[PDB]
Amino acid sequence: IPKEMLRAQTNAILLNVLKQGDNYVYGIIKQVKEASNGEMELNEATLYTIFKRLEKDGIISSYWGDESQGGRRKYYRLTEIGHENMRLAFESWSRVDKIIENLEANKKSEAI
Amino acid sequence: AEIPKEMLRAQTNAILLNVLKQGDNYVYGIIKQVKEASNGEMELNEATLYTIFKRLEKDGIISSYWGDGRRKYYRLTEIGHENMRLAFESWSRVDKIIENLEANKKSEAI
Ligand SMILES: [Au+]
């Protein structure tokens, strides 16, 4: 599995987890660990790197939590731009499957 | 907000490797079939293929040979086919992870 594809996957995951609600990193890693039957330990480093991009792009935003409790954790939130990105990713990928669909279709066409 | 470069590259590659999957081919031909399969809309630029093919050839995902004008055919390699398989399986496991996230969310909501 190429690293490019791994980080693309981690991205798909994070946008999705934040879709279901604002979260923090230790929490995000834990929920995916659970939702993948132990199998998927996300890499803190890759998360951090991704959040800098996604914060850059305004796909996510962040705020401080747990300050009332003596803490200072960082909560992330999917933005509207966030939801738009995910929509266009979906639509975009669906368009690609259709192009491939049509390639396979036209192949079987010439075979006739 | 727009679709980032990395996703664009990934998409273009998805398509090219898939054209190769369906049968070894030459570049004029590849671009023509995609033009057809995208209802006229997507006539790739040669240069984009060449850029991409250099990477893929580098990584051993594709290779090339002469056919008899004597065109240059590119072929998905075995490693090629393997990678596409594992990519598919891997991405399917990711849909399940997401599936399961949405499932656990609706669970706690109750
Ligand atoms: Au595939």
Author numbering:
A (entry chain B): 4 to 115
B (entry chain A): 2 to 69, 74 to 115
Pull verbatim passages from the article behind this deposition.
We present a new class of ArMs featuring a genetically encoded noble‐metal‐binding site based on a non‐canonical thiophenol‐based amino acid, 4‐mercaptophenylalanine (pSHF), incorporated in the transcriptional regulator LmrR through stop codon suppression. Next, we investigated the incorporation of pSHF into Lactococcal multidrug resistance regulator (LmrR), which has been demonstrated to be a highly versatile protein scaffold for artificial enzyme design.
After establishing the incorporation and position of the pSHF residues in LmrR using X‐ray crystallography, we aimed to establish the binding mode of the gold ions in LmrR_V15pSHF−Au. An X‐ray crystal structure at 2.50 Å resolution was obtained via co‐crystallisation with KAuCN2, which is more water‐soluble than Au(SMe2)Cl and has been used extensively for heavy atom phasing in protein X‐ray crystallography. The crystal structure and crystallographic Fourier maps revealed the presence of one gold ion, coordinating one of the two pSHF residues in the LmrR_V15pSHF dimer (Supporting Information section 9). The gold atom is surrounded by the side chains of Asn19, Lys22, Phe93, and Met89 at a minimal distance of 4–5 Å, establishing a second coordination sphere and restricting the solvent accessibility of the gold. No clear anomalous difference peak is present near the other pSHF residue, and the electron density of this residue appears distorted and weak compared to its counterpart in the dimer, indicative of substantial conformational disorder. Aggregate formation of LmrR_V15pSHF−Au is avoided because the two thiophenolic residues are spatially separated in the protein dimer. Of these, we selected two positions for site‐saturation mutagenesis: A11, which showed a faster reaction upon substitution to leucine, and M89, which in the crystal structure is in close proximity of the pSHF‐bound gold centre and gave rise to lower activity when replaced with alanine.
